[PDB]
Amino acid sequence: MENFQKVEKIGEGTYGVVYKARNKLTGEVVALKKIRPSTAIREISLLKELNHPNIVKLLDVIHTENKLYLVFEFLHQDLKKFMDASALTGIPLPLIKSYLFQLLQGLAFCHSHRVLHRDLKPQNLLINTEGAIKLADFGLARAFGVVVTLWYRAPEILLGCKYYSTAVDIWSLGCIFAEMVTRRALFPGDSEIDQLFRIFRTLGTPDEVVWPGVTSMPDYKPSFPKWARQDFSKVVPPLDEDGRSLLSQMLHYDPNKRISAKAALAHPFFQDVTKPVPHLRL
Template sequence: MEKYEKLEKVGEGTYGKVYKAQDKATGQLVALKKTRLEMDEEGAYRRGPAPKPLPTEVVKSFLYQLCKGIAHCHGHGVLHRDLKPQNILVDKEKMILKIADLGLSRAFTVPMKSYTHEIVTLWYRAPEVLLGATHYSTGVDIWSIGCIFAEMVRRQALFPGDSELQQLLHIFRLLGTPTEENWPGVTHLRDWHEYPGWKSQNLTRVVPTLEPEGVDLLTKMLQFDPASRISAKAAMEHPYFDSLDKSQF
């Protein structure tokens, strides 16, 4: 801490406070996250402002870096479990993306409400988690990456639910109500109920500016059956990234 001068508090998350600070030696501006590990009370959570629209090449670069970081985690047997824009830090000068709050959700259950009674966001939560699956795997992070990808492209959240039920309905209205055919075992999950039988929509409707390869990658990330979702490693090889100079990462 002696290396840095704290300038101002920029946010407060479920697990602690984030400060803007300056490296005393180099003058570089950094984000410092002070983590509250003893959870006697549920942390406050604030929803940040909607992100500004991003140029196509920036979306591509950030998505690739996100996949690369998560592929590294998954390759070491670590799930993030709480990926969302608020947990992604960007060095604006170098356009380098960093994943924060890594693995904290392994240590704690994510509270449904903060002590300020604000709902903790469900927008990036995979349907198997929303439906009460007790065993889940790397697919939970891939679903979150898909939601973040769509949000970068369309400038607003893809599934902005304000309760677990509303979250599921947002998902089902776009992707269709899941069935045993496209998601074996779904009707046996703990919180499964009978839902209206929606038909799946074409994803281009919600991301009209996204090129066809991008829509294909997004579709592969937002598969209902977690076993059918593309892996982070395979996503990095997807044709969507063919125009990206990967050597910079």
């Protein structure tokens, strides 16, 4: 490339290939994302203004030769790989707590600036050797607008609601919190209906009592099986009551009842939060 030198492919992103690259002029190592619309350019460019310790910095938006690339700060490893690497022993609770606290700070910051992620998953949560965790790709979904992982999708999205709210990110984070704890995905659906029914089998089929307006959602069907809610103590067993109470508030069916990132930061679960050093194999 004219302005960069590719080091290697990191993986397949939602919008195109993501490469580890080196800036020709500065020598800095970055995550270069090729995007496979003028409104998009202006919108994404606004995201360069976001700066928070728990948000992966969008360094630049490059539009040349009629191709679009996004330049992001490069982090050491993603949470998916770290969880896989920590499968035999599990991520220590203090580190799970630290990561959840930091992720909520990142969401609180973005949400306060009216920016949603909409597709949070372990793959876009990045960590470093110092104990920090950061979220990448906030705001891209709104700007770009559409195998895909459905495991972290909020129910309102699965039911076809075309209006998103900050609550979709809290749902995804709750799913990730559960996965760090149990070392297994909470709702590993293989299709949209399987994803929805896995949520229903665990949290109970929603109704107008727990979620006013659910029966009028676009893809809701009166024929959905009616499953009873499972005892929450069976869903993420290890986790103590503070952790379980917080998780339950992040997984409420009605997005309006779901706890905000700001309110979650004040939950008793974080009374003893610390910032441990992770054991990272790079």
